[PDB]
Amino acid sequence: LPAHPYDRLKTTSTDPVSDIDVTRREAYLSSEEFKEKFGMTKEAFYKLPKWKQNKFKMAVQLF
Tell me, what CATH number does 12's domain have?
Answer: 1.10.950.10
Q: How many domains does the chain divide into?
A: 1
Method: NMR
Burial 11-38 (b: 16+ CB within 10 A, else e): eeeeeebeeeeeeebbbbbeeebbbebb
Number of other residues whose CB lies within 10 A of the CB of residue 53: 16
Say if CB 4 and CB 62 are below 8 A apart. no
The number of CA neighbours under 13 Å toward the Cβ of 53 is 15
Q: Which range marks the domain in which residue 54 is found?
A: 1-63
Cα–Cα dist 57/50, whole Å? 10
Helices (H), the chain: 31-38, 42-47, 50-59
